[PDB]
Design a protein around this ligand. Structure first.
Ligand code: HEM
Ligand code: NA
Ligand code: NA
Length: 274
């Protein structure tokens, strides 16, 4: 084990500023980068110890063409110019970093980030499909997926609270709309809106989704509203709705863990780079 501290081969403080500038020109890329890094880690099986998480294996087939990753080409493409500018960064480090920077940019927690991920060089390391969650399914499927990733219920609910930011796109997943009225803010408001609305069927979307009664401008997936139906998940979501600092600190710990599954030999930044 034992902590290793070392300056990375790239200029992390300049890289962070370049990412922030991308976000200031196009805030929609912030939630996109958070989803990108999550899908790159979401292939993990903590039992089989496979799926090539945190390795930018999503840059290869078949993983890049799995339905759960549709739209993430826009995320990969959006970082190619920073890859060229900082050529000593791995794609895996760049994706994960861009996600932690995005979260901090949207007013979210400052999430500790370590470097050293090594990029997949071919498709042979890609694990199979059906590792990413199915939005059309409910709480048992959610628990099955998050237990396979190595998370408990408190970490599962906190991670799903990332839908505080961003929105669904019909062209990517057949789902449409934001989860909150502040989609470029990172806070507990996915839980506030979840408890604070009556969810009804949206009759105008072919894939089954909900809308809020009050405005019809929010949406929830079946997997999202399954947090209300599971007694255990509901109790945990209420704690997060009630206490944004507790939600932010739970999300920070769980998202760092996510961006580190199936990794070795990671390095802490020198206090001044972090
Ligand atoms: C039950 C588990 C989850 C399911 C079923 C799920 C499903 C989805 C779907 C279907 C979208 C819409 C994607 C699109 O059309 O562009 C989405 C967006 C998003 N998801 Fe998830 N998700 C889950 C968990 C998570 C986790 C764990 C995170 C991160 C820790 C995450 C973060 C995001 C973000 C940030 C967006 C917005 C992307 C953007 O605005 O481009 N999700 N999710
Ligand atoms: Na992967
Ligand atoms: Na929000």
């Amino acid at each position: 084990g034992r902590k290793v501290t070392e300056a990375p081969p790239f200029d992390v403080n300049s890289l962070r500023r370049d990412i922030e500038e991308i976000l200031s020109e196009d805030m929609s890329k912030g939630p996109l980068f958070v989803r990108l890094a999550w899908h790159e880690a979401g292939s993990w099986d903590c039992r089989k110890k496979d799926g090539s998480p945190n390795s930018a294996s999503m840059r290869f087939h078949p993983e890049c063409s799995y339905a759960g990753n549709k739209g993430l080409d826009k995320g990969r493409n959006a970082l190619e110019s920073l890859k060229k500018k900082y050529p000593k960064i791995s794609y895996a480090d760049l994706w994960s970093f861009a996600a932690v920077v995005s979260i901090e940019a949207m007013g979210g927690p400052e999430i500790p980030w370590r470097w050293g991920r090594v990029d997949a060089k071919d498709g042979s390391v890609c694990g199979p499909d059906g590792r990413l969650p199915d939005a059309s399914r409910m709480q048992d499927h959610v628990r099955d997926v998050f237990s396979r990733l190595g998370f408990n219920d408190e970490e599962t609910v906190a991670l799903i609270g990332a839908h505080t930011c961003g929105e669904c796109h019909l062209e990517n997943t057949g789902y449409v709309g934001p989860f909150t009225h502040d989609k470029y803010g990172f806070d507990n408001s996915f839980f506030t809106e979840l408890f604070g609305n009556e969810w009804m069927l949206n009759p105008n979307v072919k894939k089954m989704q909900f809308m809020d009664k009050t405005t019809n401008r929010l949406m929830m997936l079946p997997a999202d509203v399954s947090i209300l139906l599971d007694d255990k998940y509901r109790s945990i979501a209420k704690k997060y709705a009630d206490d944004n600092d507790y939600f932010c600190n739970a999300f920070s710990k769980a998202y760092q863990k996510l961006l580190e599954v199936g990794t070795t030999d990671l390095k802490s930044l020198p206090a001044e780079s972090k």
